[PDB]
Amino acid sequence: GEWEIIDIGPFTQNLGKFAVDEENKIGQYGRLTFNKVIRPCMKKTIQVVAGYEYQLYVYASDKLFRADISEDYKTRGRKLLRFNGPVPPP
Amino acid sequence: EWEIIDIGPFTQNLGKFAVDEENKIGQYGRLTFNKVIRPCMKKTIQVVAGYEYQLYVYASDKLFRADISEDYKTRGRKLLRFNGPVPPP
């Protein structure tokens, strides 16, 4: 899935020291002294959209070509990947 | 993951764009756009944006629930949420 349980080893314990240090910046509680991080530790790998790839059958100078073009997500920046032909119609 | 889209203006526009970019590299001479025909396929590309971490941390003998985010590209980290005290898991 998207969720995964991790070891409470060092990297994790160091995630703990960060939490408290940032908590101390806020100070909602006392001057929190870091003790330890315990099981369970949940890690959510966040997947988002980078943009797309379009596959075309396009007729150029009456010749059937297959165009592979990409487009970026937030910028709509498009780039032509491949362009071969002529190719058999589908 | 794979998607089929119609061949409307948007898609024809994609075709006008493609040819025009081929004219630049000109591996097939000067080509003139006619039309884009079925089928049109669209693939969505997903990349990792970063991570969220759910921790159970002890602070001054108090058990808290902390949520941190960490950013893929930059390793940048932020404390989303810090509540407590909370009963042991």
Author numbering:
A (entry chain A): 2 to 91
B (entry chain B): 3 to 91
What's the paper's own text on this?
Here, we engineer the hydrophobic QVVAG hinge loop from the domain-swapping cystatin, stefin B, individually into the β-turn-β motifs of the single chain variant of the sweet protein monellin (MNEI). In domain swapping, two protein molecules exchange “domains” or structural units connected by a hinge loop, such that intermolecular interactions replace the intramolecular interactions at the dimer interface of each monomer. We show that introducing the QVVAG motif into three different surface loops of MNEI results in domain-swapped dimerization, generating topologically-distinct domain-swapped dimers of MNEI. We then show that engineering the QVVAG stretch simultaneously into two different loops of MNEI creates two swappable domains in it, resulting in the formation of a double domain-swapped dimer.
A mutant variant of MNEI (L1MN) having a shorter loop1 carrying the stefin B QVVAG motif in loop1 was designed, expressed and purified. The two “subunits” of the dimer exchange “sub-domains” β1-α1-loopA-β2 and β3-loop2-β4-loop3-β5. Individually, both the subunits retain the fold of monellin, and superimpose with wt MNEI with a root mean square deviation (rmsd) of 1.2 Å. In contrast to the β-hairpin conformation observed in MNEI, loop1 exists as an extended β-strand in L1MN. Several van der Waals and hydrophobic contacts are formed between the QVVAG segments of the two polypeptide chains in the crossover region. Thus, a significant secondary interface is present in the L1MN swapped dimer. For example, L1MN has a wider angle (~160°) between its two subunits as compared to stefin B (~42°).
